[PDB]
Amino acid sequence: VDMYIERAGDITWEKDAEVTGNSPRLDVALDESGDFSLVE
Amino acid sequence: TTDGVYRVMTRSTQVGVGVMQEGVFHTMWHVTKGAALRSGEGRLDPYWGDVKQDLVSYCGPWKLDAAWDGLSEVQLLAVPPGERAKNIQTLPGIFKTKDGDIGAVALDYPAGTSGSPILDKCGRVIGLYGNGVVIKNGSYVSAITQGKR
C-alpha cells in the first residue's frame, strides 16, 4: 500500500482568474467524527 | 520537501492533495488517515492530526495560519485527478454553526481533489478544500478548513 506524494505546482494567486460559484449561507452541524451535515 | 502543492497518490490513483510549507506537509485527514507518505526516497511520518477538524500534518506542527478575512474573494488552487493545477476564484459563502461561522466555497470537484489549498490575494493558504456538505440539488459546498499553528 504505497502512498506517495508528487509535486503538482507552485502556490500562487492567478490574476484575472475565472470567477464562479455562488455564496450560500447554510446552517450546518459538525459531529465528533469531522462530518458536516445540514440543519434542516 | 520543497514548498508547493502536491498530489497524494496510492499505488496509481490520486486520493488527495496537500501543501508543503516550512518543511511540513499539510493535508486532510481523510486523504491519508495518518499513514506514512513516501517522498522520492524518503518517508514522511505524521506529526499532528485531528479527526474532527479533518486535518493532519507531517514532519512538524501545522504551519498554515492565514485566515479568510470574511469579506474578500478567494481562489481554490484545484489539483484534480488527471488534470493540471488550476486556480478558480469565488466569493465564499458561510457555514453557520453553533460554534461560529466558517467560510465555505461552492465548488464541486472529484474526491481526489481533497486537500487542495484555498488562497487569499497574497497567495497565503487560508485553508484546505474537501470537508463539506451536499445541498438539496446534489452539489457540494466545502468548508475552508484551517488548523491552528
Ligand SMILES: N=C(N)N[C@@H]1CCCCNC(=O)[C@H](CCCCN)NC(=O)[C@H](Cc2ccc(O)c(N)c2)NC(=O)Cc2cccc(c2)CNC(=O)CNC1=O
Ligand atoms: N457529492 C458531491 N457533489 N461532490 C463531492 C465532492 C468531494 C470533494 C472532496 N471531499 C471529499 O471527498 C469528502 C470526503 C469525506 C469527508 C468527511 N469528513 N466528501 C465530502 O465532504 C462529502 C461529505 C458528505 C456526504 C453526504 C452528505 O449528505 C453530506 N452533507 C456531506 N461526501 C460526499 O459528497 C459523498 C457523495 C455523496 C453523494 C454522491 C457522491 C458522493 C458522488 N460524487 C462523487 O463521487 C464525487 N464528488 C464528491 O464526492
